[PDB]
Amino acid sequence: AYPDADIAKVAQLKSSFGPEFKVSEVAPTGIDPKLLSPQKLPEGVKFEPADCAKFAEGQQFPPGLQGNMAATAAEGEGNRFIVMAVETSEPVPLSDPGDECKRVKFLGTGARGQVDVVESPQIDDARTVGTHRIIQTMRTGELYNYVASFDNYMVIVTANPLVLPDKPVAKVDTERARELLSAAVAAVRA
Helix, strand or coil, rough: CCCCCCHHEEEEEEECCCCEEEEEEEEEEEECCCHHHHCCCCCEEECCHHHHHHHHCCCCCCCCCCEEEEEEEEEEHHHEEEEEEECCCCCCCCCCCHHHHEEEEECCCCCEEEEEEEECCCCCEEEEEEEEEEECCCEEEEEEEEEEEEEEEEEEEEEECCCCCCCCCHHHHHHHHHHHHHHHHHHHHH
């Protein structure tokens, strides 16, 4: 379907960031599901709605998947953006909450937080899902995740405030994150 698709083409998105950004890259290499999924929630935390517990974990990559990943990341204007492109031997099941689970809260001794579905862009022949994770750990850590799924490809944009010692926090540029997702999918596909 996507004959010339190549996760290595995420390198193209370097040119999507101005001189105020520091850009880095991860060359194509075997997948590491731990680097791809949101960080694991602590044990014993309780969920609300309780039936929405799975969606709190965000996009998962099953431990059996084979595949490769490449990434482009940028830090600047008080944000970090990571654009990851993944190709697997079969499609990754997409995490896609219904309205019942568009907000999940959780609470435990080590942690408390919230995972909301947020607007994500329409991308031709792809499914897209956006979330906003706000996590307090023993304190607040925040990020936006945008996922695009097509065939055996998955593209993930993660955007978070830079939290630097003794500096104020900036708001996340979610507009830029969403445009990075569209641009990355178009770059990877052709």
